[PDB]
């Protein structure tokens, strides 16, 4: 089975490269330049925090998505045991 090796390259490289740009496209949208530079002095104040919140915003979500996978990872472990237990080739 070595004629399938060319399938590995094509496949993997393909999917991986597809995923990349998508991530780039996506991430790019959610990005609005720090255009506001030297337009006011107290502006920075009302600005800086807004960025701060956005960060905290993202941070908090990342934490949740995280805890989520863990919980899901456990759903799996169990869902796998139910699969084996429910084997009985009898």
């Amino acid at each position: 089975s070595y004629s399938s090796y060319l399938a590995k390259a094509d496949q993997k490289r393909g999917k991986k490269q597809t995923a990349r740009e998508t991530k780039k496209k996506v991430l790019a949208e959610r990005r609005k330049p720090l255009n506001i530079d030297h337009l006011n002095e107290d502006k920075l104040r009302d600005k800086a925090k807004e960025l701060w919140d956005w960060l905290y915003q993202l941070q908090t979500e990342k934490y949740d998505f995280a805890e989520q996978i863990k919980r899901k990872k456990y759903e799996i472990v169990t869902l796998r045991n139910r699969i084996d237990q429910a084997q009985k080739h009898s």
């Binding site: 456990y74 169990t78 045991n81 139910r82």
Partner: protein, 159 residues
């Protein structure tokens, strides 16, 4: 109509009473049945945004008289199925959670050890015999552990 039977048999006057008040608001004109449009309005008030297809499917789910509308009877049926599904989901969720608490070692099982612990962890007074007994009764596949399936079964009923 047979469904509208047990359905109304299931609910209480209290239930009907409120499900009516609720039904009335669904029904604009006050004619006697929710239309594919009268429903759409309430759905949005409820925070959804169904499509013509989606709405009908939701309608003809309890439309026994092929009317294309829902009467306070077909409605009670609908509320019932829901009431059911709701309670089922809440149950399995709770148990699901309980299993994770009892598991803790995360092997996806509950071995006689953990069973003892958790049991002994309750206020109740118990001796090993009790613990191993509950294990033997619960473990149907006689493999020593208690799988989620078995746990669902064993807890079947208990509150």
């Amino acid at each position: 109509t047979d469904q509208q039977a047990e359905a109304r048999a299931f609910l209480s006057e209290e239930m009907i009473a409120e499900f009516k008040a609720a039904f009335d608001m669904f029904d604009a004109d006050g004619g006697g049945d929710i239309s594919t449009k009268e429903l759409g309005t309430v759905m949005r008030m409820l925070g959804q945004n169904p499509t013509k297809e989606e709405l009908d499917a939701i309608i003809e789910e309890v439309d026994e008289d092929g009317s294309g509308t829902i009467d306070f009877e077909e409605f009670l049926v609908m509320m019932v199925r829901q009431m059911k599904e709701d309670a089922k989901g809440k149950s399995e969720e709770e148990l699901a959670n309980c299993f994770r608490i009892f598991d803790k070692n995360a092997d996806g099982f509950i071995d006689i050890e953990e069973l003892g612990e958790i049991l002994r962890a309750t206020g109740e007074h118990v001796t090993e015999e009790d613990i191993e007994d509950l294990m033997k009764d619960s473990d149907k596949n006689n493999d020593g552990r208690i799988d989620f399936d078995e746990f669902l079964k064993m807890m079947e009923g208990v509150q």
